[PDB]
Amino acid sequence: QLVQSGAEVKKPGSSVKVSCKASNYAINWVRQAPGQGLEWMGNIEPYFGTANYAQKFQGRVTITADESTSTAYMELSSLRSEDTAVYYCARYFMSYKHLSDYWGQGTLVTVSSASTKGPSVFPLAPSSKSTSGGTAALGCLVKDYFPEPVTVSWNSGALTSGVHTFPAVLQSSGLYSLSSVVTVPSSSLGTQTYICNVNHKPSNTKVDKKVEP
Amino acid sequence: QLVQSGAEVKKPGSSVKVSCKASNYAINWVRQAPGQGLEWMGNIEPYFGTANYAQKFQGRVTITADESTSTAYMELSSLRSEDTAVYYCARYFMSYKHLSDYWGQGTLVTVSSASTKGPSVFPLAPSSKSTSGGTAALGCLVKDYFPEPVTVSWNSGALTSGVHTFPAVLQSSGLYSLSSVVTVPSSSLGTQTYICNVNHKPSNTKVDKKVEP
Amino acid sequence: ALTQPASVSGSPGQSITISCTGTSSDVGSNNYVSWYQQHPGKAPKLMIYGGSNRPSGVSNRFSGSKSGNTASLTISGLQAEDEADYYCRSWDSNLSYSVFGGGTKLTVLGQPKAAPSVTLFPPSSEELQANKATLVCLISDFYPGAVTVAWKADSSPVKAGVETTTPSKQSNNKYAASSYLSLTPEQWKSHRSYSCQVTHEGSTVEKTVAP
Amino acid sequence: ALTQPASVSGSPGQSITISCTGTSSDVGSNNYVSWYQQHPGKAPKLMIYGGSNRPSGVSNRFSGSKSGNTASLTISGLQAEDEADYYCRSWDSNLSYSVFGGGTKLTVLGQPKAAPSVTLFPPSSEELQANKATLVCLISDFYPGAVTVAWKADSSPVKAGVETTTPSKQSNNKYAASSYLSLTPEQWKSHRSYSCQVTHEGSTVEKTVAP
Ligand SMILES: CC(/C=C/C=C1/N(CCS(=O)(=O)O)c2ccc(S(=O)(=O)O)cc2C1(C)C)=C\C=C\C1=[N+](CCS(=O)(=O)O)c2ccc(S(=O)(=O)O)cc2C1(C)C
């Protein structure tokens, strides 16, 4: 039900506008710095445009609504490094006379003066005569990108099971690398198509790699 | 906001249809026998027409909605004397993101085989040279009616303050009598107009009595 | 079902709490519990919802709480106007079925004693032509709500034909009552006068009328 | 602000409660308090609202309560899947301002020990042409989440160029981790083979690849 924009990278002291696409209760904004707890920012009511802010973010956060498209915008200025968090929109709704609140998928805003770098994608293939068991592992090395996150799908989403995308390592160089694997039946190894789809919103890079054949 | 029908008298074993005129939550029905506590009957949702009943009244109570007029009907069959109560409709609504539920004014259903009798209205006037203090009491004797309730207004509602309508006495004969007084300035006693408006819905009697001049 | 005490009484200024005990299978299953206030001759008013929330405008002297399987209403800085009936209310978790508590009569002690004022109306001409006659005695503004009423034909006591209401609470916490004397027009015109005598405590107020 | 414990741990079958202590001026002012569950890499999920109500579909093993100024979540018949972070949340009575609790890491003891399975990929041709080379070691499905990883050039230990992740919890309560070896194409083609060695507890799993 709720769709927010892609992840972003911002230089400290820049501005960031994050949108939320959508019952008539407020559109709330909640952040979570990685490893940290949740934190309320504020909300907005689509009509009258009344907005509320937690005292902390007050002034340097502007939450706006555009009724023409039922979409809400959270802006945060004076971006400092410690603003680095996942930013969710959330909105309450009523179904069974009962309550539920839908959360957005969240968008990661990383704040650093370190340059943005799109990933290099290399195929991780088995020797064919490497894999034993009617089953084989193959994948994508998504190497040397910055900042997080990266998104990997296989065969444009059509292939979804047996798919393990590992958390990234932060290399000494200050760039991330990460790996996605599919386990696949071994017999059709070099005949079936396996393409991985890499997306790294912060630099607007998309890469499709044919791992097989 | 909520308007129900007038009060009624029913012979034991008859049917009674009471209406409620009207946020989209259920329309609830609550009864109170005189001197007794409140008691939930059931409710209805204007769309889908889903209705719920307390096990007690189940079967012999039909609550209906007519969306064409946003009006709800509670019917109760097999009317026994002990059904004699005030019947309210109630409905929840949301204002300040906060809750409130509007109650109807209630309608009294009295169940008896005793005949319905509309009231006789007699004027209660002071001797003019009876009243001391720039103030005088006059009224309406609403005599010999059945069953309850009776409604008294003065000058069609225009006159509203200094108005005391006393609870009825149940006379030995099995009929009620009741009295309404206005306290009025004494100087304009026999010149100002004081009409009392008596309404006794159960027999559909309305009586207007000119008490002065 | 939900058990409340039939009545509770407190002094002005003090706080009181009315308990609403149910089961694990209702009150203790969710906090869809609410409180209602009812003054005499009025629809119930919602004071507390969801166990502890106030509707808009409702005074903050009213709080809600729920230890175990029993809800609790607490009224602070108790005032005369709080004198009324209180009802608790439960819903099932599925919100398809509700029940009320027994009701509790809250009484606020230390209300000042007040002597009744009495008004006595003679039969109207209109009624006299209908070959009937009623004397109307109106007793208002007294506390506590206990009176005895005595009619007099001249100064002889008259018991037959008397019809007196139970005193019932006005909306200022004081009581009202009425008393009706029935007699025949001839009976009315033969005596020198008639009187309704209201005795309250140390007080006797007598009003008297004449043909 | 709202204080919860940083972490709590319980055994399967038993019940536990996480406390959420605030003030009379927030948690104890109304029961607009709610509980949220968060599994790794997921949005928070509403489990309890209005102090004690479950959203539709939410298991009934989750209950809510509120003694004094502190809210309480209780999970009964505790199961492995309950392992997650829990957050409590308050609103002001005017519903214009909300705050979250610190968060609590709930851990369910008695999870079975599991040895890791390892996958080792050699550098691709594609990367070798870019004049680079990465060896990828993929360590998955282990518990507890503690491993040590050792790379070998032939059977000589190689420490330079190693980059290993902290192990982090998969969505089956087991852990995953990866380890990356960087070397130059010549460095890769000179040795007879390379091996990534995963040691977990009593276990050593070694996988090995060759140019
Ligand atoms: C709507 C509600 C409770 C309703 C309870 C009902 N109840 C339960 C009533 S009671 O609890 O017993 O008093 C009902 C019973 C029956 C019926 S029927 O007539 O149809 O049969 C209907 C109902 C209701 C009205 C559904 C609570 C809402 C809480 C909110 N809250 C408080 C949430 S929590 O309590 O902290 O979880 C809230 C906070 C913030 C924001 S915003 O600023 O982002 O827009 C908005 C909200 C909300 C207004 C959604």
CSV table of C-alpha atoms in Angstrom, one decimal, chain C residues 15-209:
chain,number,residue,atom,x,y,z
C,15,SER,CA,-11.1,11.2,45.4
C,16,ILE,CA,-13.1,8.0,44.9
C,17,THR,CA,-12.9,5.0,42.7
C,18,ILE,CA,-15.7,2.8,41.3
C,19,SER,CA,-14.6,-0.7,40.5
C,20,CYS,CA,-15.8,-2.7,37.5
C,21,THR,CA,-14.9,-6.4,38.0
C,22,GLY,CA,-15.3,-8.9,35.1
C,23,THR,CA,-13.4,-11.9,33.9
C,24,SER,CA,-10.2,-12.7,32.0
C,25,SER,CA,-12.6,-13.5,29.1
C,26,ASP,CA,-13.9,-9.9,28.9
C,27,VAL,CA,-12.5,-6.9,30.8
C,28,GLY,CA,-9.1,-8.6,31.1
C,29,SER,CA,-9.0,-9.7,27.4
C,30,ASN,CA,-8.5,-6.2,25.9
C,31,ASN,CA,-9.0,-2.6,27.0
C,32,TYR,CA,-12.2,-1.8,25.1
C,33,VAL,CA,-13.7,-0.7,28.4
C,34,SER,CA,-15.5,2.7,28.9
C,35,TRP,CA,-17.3,4.7,31.5
C,36,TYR,CA,-20.6,6.5,31.3
C,37,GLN,CA,-22.1,9.2,33.5
C,38,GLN,CA,-25.9,9.6,33.8
C,39,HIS,CA,-27.6,12.5,35.5
C,40,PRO,CA,-31.4,12.3,36.3
C,41,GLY,CA,-33.6,12.1,33.2
C,42,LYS,CA,-30.7,12.4,30.8
C,43,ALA,CA,-28.9,10.2,28.3
C,44,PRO,CA,-25.7,8.5,29.4
C,45,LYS,CA,-22.5,10.6,28.8
C,46,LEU,CA,-19.2,9.0,27.8
C,47,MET,CA,-16.5,10.0,30.3
C,48,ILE,CA,-13.7,7.4,29.6
C,49,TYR,CA,-12.9,5.2,26.6
C,50,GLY,CA,-10.2,2.6,25.8
C,51,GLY,CA,-9.8,2.2,29.6
C,52,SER,CA,-8.1,5.5,30.2
C,53,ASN,CA,-8.8,8.1,27.5
C,54,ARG,CA,-11.1,11.2,27.9
C,55,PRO,CA,-13.4,12.3,25.1
C,56,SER,CA,-12.9,16.0,24.1
C,57,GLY,CA,-14.1,18.5,26.6
C,58,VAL,CA,-14.5,15.9,29.4
C,59,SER,CA,-12.9,17.1,32.7
C,60,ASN,CA,-9.5,15.8,33.6
C,61,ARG,CA,-10.7,14.9,37.2
C,62,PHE,CA,-11.9,11.7,35.6
C,63,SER,CA,-9.3,9.0,35.2
C,64,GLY,CA,-9.4,5.2,34.3
C,65,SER,CA,-7.3,2.3,35.3
C,66,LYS,CA,-7.3,-1.5,35.3
C,67,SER,CA,-5.6,-3.8,37.8
C,68,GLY,CA,-6.1,-7.4,36.8
C,69,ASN,CA,-9.6,-8.3,35.6
C,70,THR,CA,-11.2,-5.2,37.1
C,71,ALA,CA,-11.5,-1.7,35.5
C,72,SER,CA,-11.6,1.4,37.7
C,73,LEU,CA,-12.9,4.9,37.4
C,74,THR,CA,-11.4,7.5,39.7
C,75,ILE,CA,-12.9,11.0,40.2
C,76,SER,CA,-10.6,13.5,41.9
C,77,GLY,CA,-11.4,16.8,43.6
C,78,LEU,CA,-15.0,15.5,43.9
C,79,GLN,CA,-17.7,18.1,43.4
C,80,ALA,CA,-21.4,18.2,43.9
C,81,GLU,CA,-22.0,18.0,40.1
C,82,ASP,CA,-20.4,14.6,40.1
C,83,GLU,CA,-23.4,13.2,41.8
C,84,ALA,CA,-24.9,10.8,39.3
C,85,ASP,CA,-25.0,7.2,38.1
C,86,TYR,CA,-21.9,5.6,36.7
C,87,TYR,CA,-21.8,2.7,34.2
C,88,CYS,CA,-18.8,0.7,33.0
C,89,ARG,CA,-19.0,-1.0,29.5
C,90,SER,CA,-17.1,-3.8,27.8
C,91,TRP,CA,-16.7,-4.9,24.2
C,92,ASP,CA,-15.4,-8.3,23.0
C,93,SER,CA,-12.0,-8.3,21.2
C,94,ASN,CA,-13.8,-8.8,17.9
C,95,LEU,CA,-15.9,-5.7,18.6
C,96,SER,CA,-19.2,-7.3,17.8
C,97,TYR,CA,-20.8,-7.6,21.2
C,98,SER,CA,-21.0,-5.2,24.2
C,99,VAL,CA,-22.2,-5.4,27.8
C,100,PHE,CA,-22.8,-2.8,30.6
C,101,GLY,CA,-22.1,-2.9,34.3
C,102,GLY,CA,-24.8,-2.8,37.0
C,103,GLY,CA,-24.5,0.9,37.6
C,104,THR,CA,-23.3,2.9,40.6
C,105,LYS,CA,-25.1,5.7,42.4
C,106,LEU,CA,-22.4,8.2,43.4
C,107,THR,CA,-23.4,10.5,46.2
C,108,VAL,CA,-21.5,13.5,47.4
C,109,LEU,CA,-21.9,14.2,51.1
C,110,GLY,CA,-21.9,17.6,52.9
C,111,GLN,CA,-24.6,19.1,50.6
C,112,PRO,CA,-26.2,22.0,52.6
C,113,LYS,CA,-29.7,21.4,54.0
C,114,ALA,CA,-32.4,23.4,52.3
C,115,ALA,CA,-36.0,24.1,53.3
C,116,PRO,CA,-38.7,23.6,50.6
C,117,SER,CA,-40.5,26.4,49.0
C,118,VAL,CA,-44.2,25.6,48.4
C,119,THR,CA,-46.8,26.8,45.8
C,120,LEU,CA,-50.4,25.9,46.2
C,121,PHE,CA,-52.9,26.4,43.3
C,122,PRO,CA,-56.7,26.3,43.7
C,123,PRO,CA,-58.9,24.5,41.2
C,124,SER,CA,-59.4,26.5,38.0
C,125,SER,CA,-62.9,27.6,36.7
C,126,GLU,CA,-62.3,25.4,33.8
C,127,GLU,CA,-62.0,22.3,35.9
C,128,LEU,CA,-64.9,23.3,38.2
C,129,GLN,CA,-67.1,23.3,35.1
C,130,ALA,CA,-65.9,19.8,34.3
C,131,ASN,CA,-67.5,19.1,37.7
C,132,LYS,CA,-64.1,18.3,39.2
C,133,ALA,CA,-61.6,20.0,41.4
C,134,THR,CA,-57.9,19.5,42.1
C,135,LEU,CA,-55.7,21.3,44.5
C,136,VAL,CA,-52.0,21.3,43.4
C,137,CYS,CA,-49.2,21.6,46.0
C,138,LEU,CA,-45.8,22.1,44.5
C,139,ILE,CA,-42.8,21.4,46.8
C,140,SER,CA,-39.4,22.3,45.4
C,141,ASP,CA,-35.8,23.1,46.3
C,142,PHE,CA,-35.4,20.9,49.4
C,143,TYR,CA,-32.6,18.7,50.8
C,144,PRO,CA,-32.5,15.9,52.0
C,145,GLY,CA,-35.3,14.5,49.9
C,146,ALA,CA,-37.6,13.5,52.7
C,147,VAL,CA,-40.9,15.4,53.3
C,148,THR,CA,-44.2,14.6,54.8
C,149,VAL,CA,-47.3,16.4,53.4
C,150,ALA,CA,-50.6,17.0,55.2
C,151,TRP,CA,-53.7,18.5,53.7
C,152,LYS,CA,-56.3,20.4,55.7
C,153,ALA,CA,-59.9,21.2,55.1
C,154,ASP,CA,-60.2,24.3,57.2
C,155,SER,CA,-58.0,23.0,60.0
C,156,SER,CA,-59.4,19.5,60.1
C,157,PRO,CA,-57.0,16.9,58.6
C,158,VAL,CA,-58.1,15.3,55.4
C,159,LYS,CA,-56.6,12.0,54.3
C,160,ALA,CA,-59.0,10.8,51.6
C,161,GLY,CA,-58.2,11.9,48.0
C,162,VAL,CA,-54.6,12.7,48.7
C,163,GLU,CA,-52.0,11.8,46.1
C,164,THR,CA,-48.3,12.6,46.7
C,165,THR,CA,-45.2,11.9,44.6
C,166,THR,CA,-42.0,10.3,45.8
C,167,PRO,CA,-39.5,13.2,46.0
C,168,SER,CA,-37.1,13.0,43.1
C,169,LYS,CA,-33.8,14.8,42.4
C,170,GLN,CA,-33.8,18.1,40.5
C,171,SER,CA,-30.7,18.9,38.4
C,172,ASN,CA,-29.2,21.1,41.2
C,173,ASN,CA,-29.0,18.1,43.6
C,174,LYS,CA,-32.0,19.5,45.5
C,175,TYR,CA,-35.4,17.6,45.5
C,176,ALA,CA,-38.8,18.3,44.2
C,177,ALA,CA,-42.2,16.7,44.9
C,178,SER,CA,-45.8,17.3,44.3
C,179,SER,CA,-49.0,16.5,46.1
C,180,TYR,CA,-52.5,16.5,44.6
C,181,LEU,CA,-55.8,16.8,46.5
C,182,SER,CA,-58.9,15.6,44.8
C,183,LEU,CA,-62.3,16.7,45.9
C,184,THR,CA,-65.8,17.5,44.4
C,185,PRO,CA,-66.7,21.1,43.6
C,186,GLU,CA,-69.4,21.2,46.3
C,187,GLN,CA,-66.8,19.8,48.8
C,188,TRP,CA,-64.5,22.7,47.7
C,189,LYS,CA,-67.0,25.4,48.0
C,190,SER,CA,-68.4,24.3,51.4
C,191,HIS,CA,-65.2,24.7,53.5
C,192,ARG,CA,-63.8,28.2,54.5
C,193,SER,CA,-60.4,27.2,53.1
C,194,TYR,CA,-57.9,24.4,52.3
C,195,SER,CA,-54.2,24.1,53.2
C,196,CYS,CA,-51.2,22.0,52.1
C,197,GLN,CA,-48.7,21.5,54.9
C,198,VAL,CA,-45.1,20.7,54.1
C,199,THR,CA,-42.9,19.5,57.0
C,200,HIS,CA,-39.2,18.9,56.2
C,201,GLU,CA,-37.2,18.6,59.3
C,202,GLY,CA,-37.4,21.3,62.0
C,203,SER,CA,-39.5,23.1,59.4
C,204,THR,CA,-43.2,23.4,58.7
C,205,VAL,CA,-44.3,25.5,55.7
C,206,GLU,CA,-48.0,25.7,55.2
C,207,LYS,CA,-49.8,27.4,52.3
C,208,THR,CA,-53.5,27.9,52.2
C,209,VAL,CA,-56.2,28.7,49.5
